[PDB]
Symmetry: C5
Subunit: 311 residues, 5 copies
């Protein structure tokens, strides 16, 4: 089989549609997600046209091998999609209506800057390479683009599934290629992060601040050092759940800034003890009394500045 | 091969049945489970009918390629099922008896709200897309729906395996789809959670309450801070075994509330020490004496309120 | 091809044999193991019979496609076995001798009650479904059941590989099914658990008991609380290496009981201290002196009781 | 089909090109990366030549099975590449133009010496073995070597994708092998390592140095020992993210040297206490006062020496 | 296709050769390694003899399906090898030259006794089963056995790749089997273990011995207990990187013995404090002074004894 010939000099229009059946496995570290969907293709092949009168059939079914099917591939897949042809239907004018069910692991980058309050646009790129005979161009049949209502992605809210109707036509290895951009808009469900990471992390920090109402250096050293260890435990936990970014993330900034607070609290605790030993507890008392106000204030201000910069 | 033709205008009824041989790999984080079962298909093809008196053979056996078999797929599978045809038998009237053995990874969401005292309903959705010639409709042959007695799912009690007899017929991409709902009812074996997570977590909490019978700030700071670290270790362990939910879970609520108890115990320990230093140990003594009663009481009440809200 | 016809009304006897070449990947959590073995099948097909004189050969070699081969499956496999036909030989009297080399992931439950001093019986179930023409029944050719001497299973002692000669015949979806039980008997190599888990765990517990020869509350609180943390670390390590059981395991019981010892040691340490502060160190001295004997005694007795209940 | 015959005694030149579509999964421990690219092959086969004017068709399109294609393999792949032929085009003169889309896991060693400030040269080796008829030789068509602009590798900057134009021709198992070297130049994005590993690690070390402004042995022991534990936590974290090297890495050297600092700080803390107990706090005071300067100075110098040796 | 016929009663000699292209993934816990190599096979099939005059070509090239190929398998593979036929060459006399490129996961046991100073002999066993017609026997063509210079195995030194020329011929399931032993000799690169596990582990141990120059029970309890925790952390790390052995390993012995040192140090620290409280610090002083010498001496001697027993 060869491509359908041009009546006039026109390129072949392959109408496409993707209908999500299932979406799963959004791997943050890998920046990948798995998809299970219907891929619909439609093109005109005059060679397959027939008269319904002499045939007695309004449609004609063909096996994939029997006819010419445009070679449609996904740009951003890990391995080539697992596809199973559902149905191939030919109308009397030779209009082919193809339908396959596929599953693929899509590689699409994520912006972690606002984690865990981030939204993402996942992309699925359809592509077709033009042949020497004729040029092949993709189009979106919006009637055949959608998603099942039950489509869920664990830990994410599925906003929309749409297609950028205008293809990106360009040359690659001395042949033209028509590229289409399907978009899955999702926003992270930040709920869990509050009682699991954020609040426990604030409690341990506030506990370190009780050292500002204590004169016992040994108790203070314990308070500040122990809580610092718990902060390291959470930092490590967070960095395990995320890839290494060339930028700072929101949570990453909060976490880093909290280290400075422990470092300064250690300095205060050290200073207060030194003065007490040098028989000048009145200076020490002033610093400790200031610290009780300064620490929550500077912490609250820095957090406002950060949230402002990030949102 | 093409679909069997309608005598009158009737849709084709494909009788289905799933018989579980094995169930395994219930992944809580992935919200998936693996299944190994028999899939039975039954439909009438008059073109295949014969005479039992003259043919001498009651049943005719065919190879998949030889006859028309309806394209039955699973909605909620990760990848398309691994299937092996066991047998195809044709009765004289042309009733076809298809039997395949398959294995598949089923994606079915889980409700973690009552963890680890939760029960789940796992779903397996069968589907058939109607052809242009005739409409195909699924039905449940309850005779051919079941499970082996030895079917086990590690850490779960298998309650039942049933099918919702009435299919969900609906239009999808200008064709009829017939969807069936097979249900696997399971309930979690919470036993282990008691000596592994619950009791150790209560012991460490109680140990922090011994600070209410001590005047040593340094010892108290150690008691409360150390036990708090062990609580963080268990919180992290629990969150590793669970996916990120947009809601609170039972264990999650208990764990979160316990943090507040440590935070308040630190406050009390701080307050008691401050008063002792300000040479007013009678006030301190009152607060500590109150704490000895208040802490177990408020803990026990809060737990009743929580269990009430969750069950 | 169709099944060999019955001379009299007899069922077809398929003689089976499994010869282990390799045993590996015993996953405790998954309750699975991988196997690489020879599967031998033998049955009589009169239609295949010949005369050695006329033919000039005493054996006939066919390709799988050429003859009727019984559809033998494994009940307890994750996915259908990876098989490669080694040879198919026909005797003049129509006795077929089939040999395949296969590899499969077998799902077989494990009894963790006596861990790490447990022995297991791994099962491999062979099955055959009867056809409408004739009934098929499995048998064990003990001459063709065995294992290579070099077969090893990391962290386990391979006791025996035997077959239960009498098949379990039963009805499934109105057809006779012949089930065979091949058994691999193994016992765990508990050696490692002594210097890795058991002894370190006893040392930390004994270290906590040095608090019984100390009057320093602050030092005691440190001794008891620190060692308790190390015990949590080991409990978590152990539970990672094991699945969630609806029963208690031997190690699990020891681990749980040790928690009670830390809890009581904390009480003693608290009591003693409280006394000293109330200016009554003679009572405190009595309790501490009792504890020095009581703790090792109650620990040693409880361990005898436990070992008795478990073995 | 057999290879195209030599006009004169010349070896067959297969022009090659690799165009990266996607690059992902750079596993540091495994020293592997996954690639998705176009593989282009061009050679000339006079048997396939035709007339442009007479035939009317400028280019003829064949199916892989129809013509002779050189057996091109990758040297450094884990498993043989997953390839799908996109197009085969024959010019009148008989120049074949082959194009496949492939995906493969490439095993290419990494130099960890400068981690996390390292750059790597990933290799992809193309190979062809000669046949008995004629010798096959590879060449690079630089016009068909490249990468998509959107090619990204998480945690790395993609510098270049080039080919060493001249093949490595050599004999292996008494036949000619023609090997080509495609190079992917990448440099690590060290940004993250600063707020995640480097800075937290320096803070805990500076905290240990506050022991130089304290006379409390008990507080010092806590300061130095606790911070040492946090340093062990980071060392373990780092070694989990890296393979075992027969050499020292930059981070590895910093980490190791920091251990010496804790060891010496413990000695100082021990020495200072011993003198204080021996009623000679003037000597102790001198050592502690020296330590306050010596520690940051020796640390800063050693780091300069190390960075010098490593860069 | 059937086996070639004997010309006297001789068994068929299949000459074999394995040429390593790549070796990777040496999994210590799984006791497996992955290999990518050429498998060369040579036997003579007189039925394939040809006159170059008539055929035109001096050497004929066949497709695997076209001719008889001896069924060669690997004994110790997890799953059957992934093979791709590179070439099948037939000389006029009928000598067949078969070349395939394969990849396989080889299961070969490891001796951990001297870890991390151990050397291993990895095995790859080739096997052939004799047919009823004629006996097949394997031979090594040493000219076709080797490895690429660039063959590397992360964390190991590749010593040699050789074959035991004499096959192991033996009966199995009433047929003859010809087994060949290919050996890959490797030795572990212990470098990393020194700054990563060994030295940090010694530093923490020595840090505890500073308790021998202190009279502060509270400080000593902290020193000894804290360092003990760090030792548990390293023990766990080490046991994660190793399988459970029925014997002791070198590192395992060192690690276990170090536990005894902490246990005895706790006893000394307890004893010293008890005497100090009983107002007899002169006895305490003697024990502590002895400990300062005894501990490093007994540690150094025990290590000599251990290294002696292990090497
Ligand atoms: C640690 C200190 C506290 C950190 C909390 C940061 C939350 C935040 O400020 O995050 C912001 C997000 C919403 O942002 P958005 O939907 O992306 O809006 C983008 C539109 N703009 C560009 C106009 C802004 O949070 C929330 O809706 C609720 C967060 C509850 C936090 C309770 C604790
Ligand atoms: C820490 C504080 C204690 C936590 C214990 C919570 C147990 C609980 O309250 O859980 C209750 C569940 C049963 O609930 P159900 O079967 O789903 O009822 C659903 C039916 N309704 C809707 C009518 C209610 O557990 C048990 O049978 C025994 C649990 C013993 C726990 C011992 C500790
Ligand atoms: C913590 C306290 C110590 C725990 C040790 C329990 C050992 C045990 O008691 O286990 C007993 C098992 C053997 O049992 P079996 O072969 O299954 O007997 C089955 C036959 N019956 C049914 C008659 C009982 O161990 C051993 O032979 C050696 C154990 C060395 C332990 C050294 C420490
Ligand atoms: C712990 C102590 C501090 C460690 C920081 C050392 C950084 C370093 O020393 O690294 C230096 C590298 C650059 O190296 P390059 O680009 O490969 O030069 C190769 C060319 N030659 C051969 C001519 C040298 O980093 C940087 O540009 C910025 C480092 C910021 C670190 C912030 C802290
Ligand atoms: C903790 C206490 C120190 C432990 C170090 C033990 C090293 C050892 O003793 O191991 C010895 C091995 C060599 O052994 P081999 O190559 O197998 O010799 C086999 C031949 N025989 C049987 C004749 C002996 O290491 C080395 O070449 C140097 C190791 C430097 C270690 C630095 C610390
Ligand atoms: Cl694709
Ligand atoms: Cl399916
Ligand atoms: Cl099977
Ligand atoms: Cl390849
Ligand atoms: Cl093999
Ligand atoms: Na302390």
């Amino acid at each position: 089989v060869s491509p359908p010939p041009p009546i006039a000099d026109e390129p072949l229009t392959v109408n496409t549609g993707i209908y999500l059946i299932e979406s799963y496995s959004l791997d943050d570290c890998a920046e990948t997600f798995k998809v299970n969907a219907f891929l619909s293709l439609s093109w005109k092949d005059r060679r397959l046209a027939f008269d319904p009168v002499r045939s007695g059939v309004r449609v004609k079914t063909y096996e994939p091998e029997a006819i010419w099917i445009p070679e449609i591939r996904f740009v951003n897949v890990e391995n080539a999609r697992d596809a199973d042809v559902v149905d191939i239907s030919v109308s009397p004018d030779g209009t082919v209506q193809y339908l396959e069910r596929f599953s693929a692991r899509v590689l699409s980058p994520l912006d972690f800057r606002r984690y865990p309050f981030d939204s993402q646009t996942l992309h699925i790129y359809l592509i077709v390479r033009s042949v020497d005979t004729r040029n092949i161009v993709l189009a979106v049949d919006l009637e055949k683009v959608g998603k099942n209502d039950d489509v869920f992605l664990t830990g994410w809210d599925i906003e929309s599934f749409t297609a950028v109707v205008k293809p990106a036509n360009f040359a690659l290895e001395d042949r033209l290629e028509s590229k289409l951009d399907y978009q899955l808009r999702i926003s992270r469900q930040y709920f869990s992060y509050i009682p699991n990471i954020i609040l426990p992390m604030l409690f341990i920090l506030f506990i370190s601040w009780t050292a500002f109402w204590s004169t016992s250096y040994e108790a203070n050293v314990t308070l500040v050092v122990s809580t610092l260890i718990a902060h390291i435990a959470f930092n490590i936990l967070v960095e395990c759940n995320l890839p290494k970014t060339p930028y700072m993330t929101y949570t990453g900034a909060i976490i880093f800034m909290i280290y400075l607070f422990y470092f300064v609290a250690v300095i205060e605790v050290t200073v207060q003890h030194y003065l007490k030993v040098e028989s000048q507890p009145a200076r020490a008392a002033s610093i400790t009394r200031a610290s009780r106000i300064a620490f929550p204030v500077v912490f609250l201000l820095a957090n406002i500045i950060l949230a402002f910069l990030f949102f």
